[PDB]
């Protein structure tokens, strides 16, 4: 059924190595055994490998990186690590919702950045927020603004990548990836693989695990 160039598969959240504060969050949220992109998926991310991965959107897809960005970041320092990007306001409002739950045993602060934050409220969660979710263009928004500290940034992922593109956030993306670190991890899921996602991949990943199909 699906297609990767990684060979390591684990079907337990127990044989991941996870942190005990975060797999705690895992059970905690309902979590049982991995799904089938998760077994795949969730390794390869929480290694440091860029990540081309085919899903859906669900339960899976999002848990996929989100476990994964947790486990990654380091809760001392309160500054952002990993970027989210999702298609619409609501989209990056449910990976905060998903994030923070499976995040209720560790000190980690999610800051969403979307439409209807003021400027005061979007500084002071961008500061010290080790995580942030949102869309291209607030999340551009703020850094051409210098509201938003990319220093510390570890991992960018782009959910719903193909969605995110025929909405016109080439640009805001593209221009994005220039104000991360060039050190940063890079992540994209995608339920369908077309040009454009494509473009993205080739231009932006170093010999990536691909997870197709």
């Known amino acids: 059924q699906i297609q990767t160039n990684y060979q ?7 044989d991941m190595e996870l942190d005990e504060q975060l797999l705690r969050g895992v059970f905690g949220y309902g979590f049982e055994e991995p799904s089938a992109i998760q077994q795949r998926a969730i390794m390869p991310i929480i290694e440091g490998h860029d990540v ?3 899903a859906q959107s669900g339960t899976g897809k999002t848990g996929t990186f989100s476990i994964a960005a947790l486990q990654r970041i380091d809760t001392s320092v309160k500054a952002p690590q990993a970027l989210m990007l999702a298609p619409t ?30 400027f ?15 869309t291209p263009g607030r999340v551009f928004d703020n850094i051409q603004r210098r509201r938003f500290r990319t220093d ?6 782009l959910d719903e990548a193909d969605e995110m ?16 670190p060039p050190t940063t991890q890079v992540v994209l899921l995608s339920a369908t693989m077309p040009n454009d996602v494509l473009e993205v991949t080739t231009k932006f990943m170093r010999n990536p695990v691909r997870i197709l199909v």
Do not use: N, P, W
């Open 89 to 118: 306001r609501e989209l990056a409002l449910q990976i905060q919702k998903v994030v923070m739950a499976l995040a209720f045993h560790m000190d980690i602060k999610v800051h969403a950045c979307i439409g209807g934050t003021s």
């Open 8 to 14: 390591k598969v684990v079907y337990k959240f127990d």
């Open 165 to 180: 593109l025929s909405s016109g956030f080439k640009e805001q993306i593209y221009q994005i990836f220039t104000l991360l």
């Open 52 to 54: 081309l991965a085919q």
């Open 120 to 134: 005061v409220e979007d500084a002071e969660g961008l500061r010290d927020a080790q995580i942030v979710v949102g």
């Open 152 to 157: 510390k940034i570890k991992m960018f992922i």
